[PDB]
Each structure stands twice: as structure tokens, then as C-alpha cells.
Amino acid sequence: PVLRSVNSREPSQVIFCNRSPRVVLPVWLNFDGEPQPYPTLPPGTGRRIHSYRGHLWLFRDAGTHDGLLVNQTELFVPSLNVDGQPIFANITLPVYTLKERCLQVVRSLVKPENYRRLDIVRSLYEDLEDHPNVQKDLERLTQERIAHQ
Amino acid sequence: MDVFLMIRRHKTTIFTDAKESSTVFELKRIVEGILKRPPDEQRLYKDDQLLDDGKTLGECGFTSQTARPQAPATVGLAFRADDTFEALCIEPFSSPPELPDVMK
Amino acid sequence: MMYVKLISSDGHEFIVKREHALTSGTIKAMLSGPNETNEVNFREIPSHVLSKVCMYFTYKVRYTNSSTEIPEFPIAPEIALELLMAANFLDC
Amino acid sequence: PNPPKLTKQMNAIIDTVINYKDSSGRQLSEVFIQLPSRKELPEYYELIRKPVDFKKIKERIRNHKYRSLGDLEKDVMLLCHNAQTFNLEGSQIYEDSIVLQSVFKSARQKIAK
Ligand SMILES: Cc1ncsc1-c1ccc(CNC(=O)[C@@H]2C[C@@H](O)CN2C(=O)[C@@H](NC(=O)C2(F)CC2)C(C)(C)C)c(OCCCN2CCC(c3ccc4c(c3)n(C3CCCC3)c3nc(=O)c5c(Br)cccc5n43)CC2)c1
């Protein structure tokens, strides 16, 4: 797998800093590229955590799995600890498209079973049902990384 | 510091940004460039109160906390109509329909 | 700066920076082929929805490429479906 | 309290197992040092009736709970069997416990010579 943690033995202290209004789910990509859910971060909180250089992390809304950014990007990799200092992983909301933001709100208000009882254009039902998922986003990111290489 | 504004007259709304340190007159100059009416032919309001030309936007009450891009502050605009300033009039936007039952 | 006029189904006129309106591919397509030069009319987008769309163009322009904590774009339950319909049409 | 020669042997064997590094330089004992908490992984405590880790083993040498090399062997064999019970065959951790079990046997032979 292209997106996976490197089996490194280099310890790396990180500050997971939740600068978003959501409950954050940190996701560690294991050595076999499989996503591993870690303890959640309430909004406006930070935790000093133990990781390794070369380890791959993703951040999602814990409740919905909506995508979040870390240091203005999708993946976080602990790197060089300058003069002992822990690495800061600033977790924030992306500037979502209006469509994706609307989908989020409609999803929070309607049960999936009731999506097709809404009076909207047919393709919007498909978008409502295309729930945000770690595995889905990984597949897209894998293609994105392969195209660069 | 940037302030995000809705300048409203009747059925017209101008969406614009400005500096907190910028003045009412500079904002009247932005209105002139768009609606082709000189500053003296305009009256600007923050709710019921008429804003003075010299006063900064921050002095009027427009701060980053209240004039947000996703929630702009309303600046009322009145023009001199039939040789005299018309009463301040802003037409309301439409009303959202009854919320769907599956959304209830 | 250039300005464009976006007109709601109920005749409300929203004057926004050309740059903000070009966020939408649909708006771009209707500013390059249809009454005036930089005026676009939306026959099915009401003023309570169009106003929120203009707020969204502002929010997007301000918060894209910025080192600041990004606030949530708020959307009231009552405008949620109609805002979804327009955002879909507009591709925003 | 145990005789001083016995305590030295126990620590020498356990240090060999813990400081064991494979071909890649990876310390196989690393994940086995500390058990997962009962809060984070309650299934582990529902499945494994006698949980042990290398910190618990070190503490049992130190407090003279093991009165022989056989007593120490039983706990290392229990840690490895636990690892082999909870985790799937072929997983890194399952495989690491197989190697640690072998390293223990060799280290006990060396000290007995
Ligand atoms: C607080 C907070 N808020 C937001 S994020 C957060 C937070 C942040 C950090 C931590 C701790 N840090 C890590 O988990 C880091 C992160 C990422 O970089 C990978 N990682 C590791 O440490 C990995 N290790 C290594 O790469 C190396 F050490 C070899 C170099 C490892 C997962 C494979 C262990 C945290 O940890 C809490 C949850 C993390 N889990 C890590 C694995 C743990 C574990 C520990 C001991 C185990 C074990 C599993 N398993 C299995 C394997 C998985 C299923 C259970 C197992 N089976 C056994 O049978 C056994 C026995 Br016999 C004896 C002793 C331990 C044993 N263990 C359980 C907790 C919470």
C-alpha cells in the first residue's frame, strides 16, 4: 500500500491541537495501510501524544467522518523535532464547498431512510447517501499520490 | 482588521468588505462607484442611527466580531429622492417555507 | 474591482465582486451567454437563499489560503434544502 | 527474599529478551512491555484470564515472587501464549511472541552453561 506508516523506531512527540468546532477522530494508518481509530479530541482541546517519525495520520469529524485538515493538508507525518520541541498538528475545518456543507446539514437533520422523501433533484439523493468515509478518502488519496509519482 | 458588510436600499444589496479604520465617507465612495450617486446624495445607517462621514467603521460599531464574512453586518442606505432624503427602506428577503416533515 | 448583479426570483438585486461570483461555474457560464451586461437572473432562486449564497462566496474568498481558525459556515434548518438545491445548480 | 545468584540470572535472561533486536533493529519486546488498559481494550481482559507484560515480570523478579528459573519461564510462556491467543496467526505481534519465546529458551541455556 502507498499510504501507510513506515516501520520506524524514531520517537516523535506531537501536540494534537483541535482548532475546529467538531469532536475530532485521529486516524493512524498502520504499517499495512489500514486505518486505526484513536481516542477522540473534544473541540478546543489539545493533547501531547507519542508517535514515530514517518507515521501517517488523518483527522475526521468523530460523529460524521467529515474530512478535516491538519497543518492545512489531508495527511500528517511527524518529522524533525526542532531542539526537543513537540511537533504541532493544527487540526482545522476545511473551507468546504457550499454543496458539501449543505449535504452535512441535511444529513444531521434527516434519517438516511427518509432521504428519498425530500423534494430534490435525483442526483442529490445519491450525494446524500455518499456518506464521508475514511476508506473512500484513502482510495482517492492513493490515486492522487500515484499521479504525482 | 476587515469588516464584512451588506449595504441595503429597497431591493438592492451590495456585498462588500472594508477596513475597520476606514471611514463612512470612503464607504459612500464605494457606493458611488457602484450606484452612480455622489456621497452627499447618500445617508448611511447602523440600524435606526444615521452615521457621520468622518467617523470610522469601528466607531459606528462595525468590528470583526459582528461584521463576519459568513454573517455580514447590515448598513442601511437612503438616497435623496424628489429633492429630499427618502425614509430608510429595506425590503425584507423572502421567507423559508414550512420545514419538511422528515426534517422535523 | 468589477461588480456583477445577481437577481433573485422575487426581484432582489445582490451586487457582489465579479471574483466572488466567478466561484460558480454556472454564474461564469451565464455571464458569457444569456438584461444588462453583468446582470444574471435566477428564476428559481429566492432572495433568502441567494443572500446566503453571496455570504458563502465572501466566506470562501476570505478563508481560502489563510492561516486562521476557520469558523463553521452556518446554515439554519429551514433554509437547508433550498440552499442545497441552489448550491447544486450553481456547483458551489 | 531469593539468593543473590538467582536474582542476577533472572534479570540477565529477562534483559536479553527485552533488549532483543531482530535483523531490522526493531525491539520485538516494545509492545509487550505494557498491557493495553482495561478501559481501551476490555475484550482482552474478558478473553485472557491471566494477563501479564514485561513490566509485571520485572516487578515479580524484584519482589522475589519467582523462586526459580522455572517460575520465571512460566510467566514468559504465559505472556507469549496470551499474545498467541488474543491475536491472529500471521499478525506482526503474534510472530514477535514466537521469536521472544525462542530468545527466552536460548538465554536460559546460556546462563545454565
Ligand atoms: C490520548 C490520545 N488522544 C488522541 S490520540 C491519543 C493517543 C496517541 C498516542 C497513543 C500511544 N501511541 C501510539 O499508539 C503510537 C501512535 C502511532 O504512531 C502508532 N503508535 C504506536 O505506539 C505503535 N508502536 C510502534 O510503532 C513502536 F512502539 C514499535 C515502535 C503501536 C500501535 C504498534 C503500538 C495513544 O495510545 C492509546 C491507544 C493506542 N493503542 C496502541 C496499541 C496498544 C497495545 C499495547 C499492548 C498490546 C496490544 C496493543 N496488543 C494487541 C495488538 C492490537 C490488538 C491488541 C497486545 N496483545 C498482547 O497480547 C499483549 C501482551 Br501478551 C502483553 C503486553 C501487551 C500486549 N498487547 C493499545 C493502545 C493515544
Author numbering:
A (entry chain B): 61 to 209
B (entry chain D): 1 to 104
C (entry chain C): 16 to 49, 55 to 112
D (entry chain A): -2 to 110
What do the authors report?
We aimed to achieve orally bioavailable molecules that selectively degrade the BAF Chromatin Remodelling complex ATPase SMARCA2 over its closely related paralogue SMARCA4, to allow in vivo evaluation of the synthetic lethality concept of SMARCA2 dependency in SMARCA4-deficient cancers. Heterobifunctional molecules co-recruit a target protein and an E3 ligase, resulting in ubiquitylation and proteosome-dependent degradation of the target. The synthetic lethality between SMARCA2 and SMARCA4, resulting in sensitivity of SMARCA4-deficient cells to loss of SMARCA2, has been discovered and validated by genetic methods, but pharmacological validation and exploitation of this synthetic lethal relationship has been hampered by the lack of suitably selective small molecules, in particular for effective in vivo use in animal models. We found that design of linker composition and exit vector placement could be guided and rationalised by ternary co-crystal structures, yielding molecules which exhibit high potency and suitable pharmacokinetic properties to translate to oral in vivo efficacy.
PROTACs with PEG- and alkyl-based linkers showed moderate target degradation in RKO cells, with 27–75% maximal degradation (Dmax) for SMARCA2. Notably, compound 5 demonstrated partial degradation of SMARCA2 (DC50 = 78 nM, Dmax = 46%) while sparing SMARCA4 completely.
